[PDB]
């Protein structure tokens, strides 16, 4: 970790923190919510040691990267704009892409707008989110799960931030990271409360050290949750703006990997989309989907070595 290089670069008008290690084909890692570049620590070390150039930024709004004040500065187009600028700075025509959670949503947008810049994509947790022309993204979630569904509760500016403040940053991060409950996360009414996990363990699970959690806390306690939350606040706007790509397929080779207990997999009719034929129809060069038994949402950390090996085996093919 000591030999991971950290720098700040100017991309698309913002200052972005980039963590990098190794030489070789670029493997660009995109973290999720509420994470950081650091979520890829094990993959950065493994892929760099195995002859690749591992690159893992803090995305716009996160960690040591600039957080614009306007909520509207966090559409998928803004984030992809940052990443295209980053790839140009890296000096390469194409990358191998690896992404998780919100990072995976952004990765799907990258593959939609610029498939030629992506040789192959290892996608964790969140598959392609089919644009339903009949109903907006968050409107559909609201109809399915109601107003206490977490994504709905994340919409109103400032509200979730205050609820998180009441219980504290360390509690929020431990609450989220340790969750193993399947199904749609429904919050208690009017407060954070038990949030994502009504059965928090006393000890951190063995994949997350006290120092790991402390590092996440050290960033979030200062810069807060607003930047990361703002991605969710643009889901309906993203839906509007992506009308030009309605009914579109992605031809980038994809390997999709999820923990079996991930709340994403176990909600939103995702399991049916993933295995039922819809995912493959939209993504014709999708390879065998991997479901990791007894693994939760944070599969790049909880099953880090398996993820290292799946990434390595897949990108070698190309």
Protein model, in words:
A hairpin with a 2-residue loop joins strand 1 and strand 2. This protein has one domain: Alpha/Beta hydrolase fold, catalytic domain (Rossmann fold), CATH 3.40.50.1820. 39% of the residues lie in helices and 15% in strands. Strands 1-2-4-3-5-6-7-8 form an 8-stranded mixed beta sheet, sandwiched between helices. With 318 residues, it is an alpha/beta fold. It is classed as hydrolase. Keywords: Hydrolase, Epoxide Hydrolase.
Structural class, from secondary structure content? alpha/beta
The total strand number stands at 8
CATH topology: Rossmann fold
Largest sheet: 8 strands, mixed
Order of helices and strands: EEEHEHEHEHHHHHHHEHHEHH
Tally of helical segments: 14
The share of residues in helices is 25-40%
Number of domains: 1
Going by CATH, the homologous superfamily would be: Alpha/Beta hydrolase fold, catalytic domain
Beta strand %? 5-15%
**What is the CATH top level name?**
Alpha Beta
Dominant shape: globular
Distance between the termini: 28 Å
CATH architecture: 3-Layer(aba) Sandwich
Organism: Vigna radiata (Mung bean)
Pathway: Secondary metabolite biosynthesis; terpenoid biosynthesis
InterPro entries: AB_hydrolase_1, AB_hydrolase_fold, Epox_hydrolase-like
Protein name: soluble epoxide hydrolase
Short description:
Residues 25-139 form the AB hydrolase-1 domain. With 318 residues, this protein is α/β, with parallel strands linked by helices. The chain has a single domain, classed as Alpha/Beta hydrolase fold, catalytic domain (Rossmann fold).
Question: Which helices and strands occur, and which strands form pairs?
Answer:
Blueprint: E1 5-11, E2 14-21, E3 26-30, H1 41-49, E4 53-57, H2 76-90, E5 95-100, H3 102-113, E6 118-124, H4 137-145, H5 150-153, H6 159-167, H7 169-177, H8 210-223, H9 226-232, H10 235-241, E7 254-259, H11 270-276, H12 278-282, E8 290-292, H13 299-302, H14 304-316
Helix pairs in contact: 1-14, 2-3, 7-8
